[PDB]
Write an enzyme that holds these catalytic residues in place. Structure first.
Site, PDB file in Angstrom:
ATOM      1  CB  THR A  16     -15.086   5.411  12.509  1.00  0.00           C
ATOM      2  OG1 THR A  16     -16.010   6.380  12.663  1.00  0.00           O
ATOM      3  CG2 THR A  16     -14.233   5.226  13.636  1.00  0.00           C
ATOM      4  CG  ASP A  39      10.478   7.724  -3.734  1.00  0.00           C
ATOM      5  OD1 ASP A  39      10.685   8.081  -4.774  1.00  0.00           O
ATOM      6  OD2 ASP A  39       9.671   7.004  -3.484  1.00  0.00           O
ATOM      7  CG  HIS A  69       7.580   8.317  -6.780  1.00  0.00           C
ATOM      8  ND1 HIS A  69       8.354   7.616  -5.810  1.00  0.00           N
ATOM      9  CD2 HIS A  69       6.287   7.583  -6.878  1.00  0.00           C
ATOM     10  CE1 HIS A  69       7.654   6.625  -5.655  1.00  0.00           C
ATOM     11  NE2 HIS A  69       6.514   6.413  -6.222  1.00  0.00           N
ATOM     12  CG  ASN A 161       2.190  -0.828 -10.143  1.00  0.00           C
ATOM     13  OD1 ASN A 161       3.042  -1.763  -9.899  1.00  0.00           O
ATOM     14  ND2 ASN A 161       2.058   0.120 -10.848  1.00  0.00           N
ATOM     15  CB  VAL A 177       9.182  -4.397   6.678  1.00  0.00           C
ATOM     16  CG1 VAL A 177      10.978  -4.691   6.935  1.00  0.00           C
ATOM     17  CG2 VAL A 177       8.723  -5.086   5.279  1.00  0.00           C
ATOM     18  CG  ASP A 200       2.133  -6.385   7.842  1.00  0.00           C
ATOM     19  OD1 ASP A 200       2.059  -7.358   8.707  1.00  0.00           O
ATOM     20  OD2 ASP A 200       3.159  -6.126   7.168  1.00  0.00           O
ATOM     21  CB  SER A 224       4.337   5.100  -4.409  1.00  0.00           C
ATOM     22  OG  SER A 224       5.030   4.241  -5.103  1.00  0.00           O
TER      23      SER A 224
HETATM   24 CA   LIG Z   1       4.681  -7.816   8.139  1.00  0.00          CA
END
Ligand SMILES: [Ca+2]
Length: 279
Positions: A16, A39, A69, A161, A177, A200, A224
């Protein structure tokens, strides 16, 4: 379970408050779930994956990760030391070349591949896809991400980014998504993180230690890096029976730490992924 001296990002998603270094999680650890990392590939032979990773598809002359990556992102999902979901199965889909680039038609092909390929894998607890990539808006790319989600895969995507509104990037801008921004260890929005009403959730994205190619490790930054935290957390929660692929983004937002981040532009959610684990 408790892992001491964990990477800060693992500690943060089980806390928390910032400023602690122990990762607390249920021992089930995403067993019986599957996560596709779409990726540059995955160095499956890395000791950190313990035989739980494999390459299932490439669109290039090799399935090898020649970049690093994809191995790093996979590491944050499911490596033993650096991963959220330490017992998940990892599948690699190489849509990006070893320079980190890919044409949209290849990326689209990779997403439709996962929608089908999950029918060839044993993932009783559910399937996640982690997409730490993007570029300028494309309705075709968004549509592919929406189909993957619709097919019953929890899709987590990087917001980008550019320190800009993510509505202008794909597949970040696809509403169906789970679009993930980045935070730092002091609970600030990462300075590069995109923002906007399409986000989100936030996860740890600045200075994230994980696996690299050549059997190595390193710390790097980006949305990423935030994305696999959320992908791994979804796999963990689905193993526990708390949520499903269709509902996981909503569940993560509902149970997130609220109001803890700074430098959140007006209109962007102030929600930080949290596993709600009580030992
Ligand atoms: Ca969404």
């Amino acid at each position: 379970a408790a892992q001491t001296n964990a990477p800060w990002g693992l500690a943060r998603i089980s806390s928390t408050s910032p400023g602690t270094s122990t990762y607390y999680y249920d021992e089930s650890a995403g067993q019986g779930s599957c996560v596709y990392v779409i990726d540059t590939g995955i160095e499956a032979s890395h000791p950190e994956f313990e035989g739980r990773a494999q390459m299932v598809k490439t669109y290039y002359y090799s399935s090898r990760d020649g970049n690093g990556h994809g191995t790093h992102c996979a590491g944050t999902v499911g490596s033993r030391t650096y991963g959220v979901a330490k017992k998940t199965q990892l599948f690699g889909v190489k849509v990006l070349d070893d320079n980190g680039s890919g044409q949209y038609s290849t990326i689209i092909a990779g997403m439709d591949f996962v929608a089908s390929d999950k029918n060839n894998r044993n993932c009783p607890k559910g399937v996640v896809a982690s997409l730490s990539l993007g570029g300028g808006y494309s309705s075709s790319v968004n549509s592919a991400a929406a189909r993957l989600q619709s097919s019953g895969v929890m899709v987590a995507v990087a917001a980008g980014n550019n320190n800009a509104d993510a509505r202008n990037y794909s597949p970040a801008s696809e509403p169906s998504v789970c679009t993930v921004g980045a935070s730092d260890r002091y609970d600030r929005r990462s300075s590069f993180s995109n923002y906007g009403s399409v986000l989100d959730i936030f996860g740890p994205g600045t200075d994230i230690l994980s696996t690299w190619i050549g059997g190595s490790t390193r710390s790097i930054s980006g949305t990423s890096m935030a994305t696999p935290h959320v992908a791994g957390l979804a796999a963990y929660l689905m193993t526990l029976g708390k949520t499903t692929a269709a509902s996981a983004c909503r569940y993560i937002a509902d149970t997130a730490n609220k109001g803890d981040l700074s430098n959140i532009p007006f209109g962007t959610v102030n929600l930080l992924a949290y596993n709600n684990y009580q030992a």
